[PDB]
Amino acid sequence: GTSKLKYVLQDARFFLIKSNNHENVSLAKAKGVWSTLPVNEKKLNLAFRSARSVILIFSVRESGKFQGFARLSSESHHGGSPIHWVLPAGMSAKMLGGVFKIDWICRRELPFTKSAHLTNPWNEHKPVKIGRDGQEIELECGTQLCLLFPPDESIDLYQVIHKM
Numbered sequence: 001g002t003s004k005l006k007y008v009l010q011d012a013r014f015f016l017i018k019s020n021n022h023e024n025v026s027l028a029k030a031k032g033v034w035s036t037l038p039v040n041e042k043k044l045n046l047a048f049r050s051a052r053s054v055i056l057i058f059s060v061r062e063s064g065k066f067q068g069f070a071r072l073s074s075e076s077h078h079g080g081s082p083i084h085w086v087l088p089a090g091m092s093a094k095m096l097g098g099v100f101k102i103d104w105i106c107r108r109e110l111p112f113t114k115s116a117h118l119t120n121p122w123n124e125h126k127p128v129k130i131g132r133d134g135q136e137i138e139l140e141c142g143t144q145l146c147l148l149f150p151p152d153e154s155i156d157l158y159q160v161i162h163k164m
């Protein structure tokens with residue numbers, strides 16, 4: 001069903017996450033973590049305290065798809081086991097911010113061809129696929145985008161609801 005998902009998404013905030021490679025998204029799906037540059041780390045920490053759910057919607061650059069979405073379960077923290085992210089040419093692990101814990105809500109892909117009717121008011125009403133890493137997605141657009149993904153029957157949202 002979609003009812004528990006709608007409950008998790010009620011009054012949530014949404015952020016577009018752009019990764020240069022599939023390796024980082026696969027790591028995030030396996031380990032339940034994300035890290036971003038400090039400018040975006042600060043925004044996500046503010047958002048985490050402000051709303052009952054903060055949703056990250058992931059897209060690998062040049063893939064033509066989103067790769068899933070997850071909910072922040074923590075603010076960023078430093079000093080864990082170093083995650084072996086593949087950073088793009090010119091980027092070093094020192095340039096990253098802290099580590100956020102995330103709970104995946106959907107690990108399934110959605111092609112951009114399916115979201116062409118959704119525009120993001122916070123990015124000049126451009127199609128929601130368009131945006132820099134960290135672009136916030138307005139509530140209605142983000143809710144409808146998450147509802148377009150195929151259901152991920154491997155995930156039980158009962159375990160996310162209790163953290164809210």
Ligand SMILES: CNC(=O)[C@H]1CCNC1
Nearest residue numbers: 018019024035036085133
């Ligand atoms: C693992 N973290 C990333 O790949 C971030 C870095 C900047 N945009 C995506």
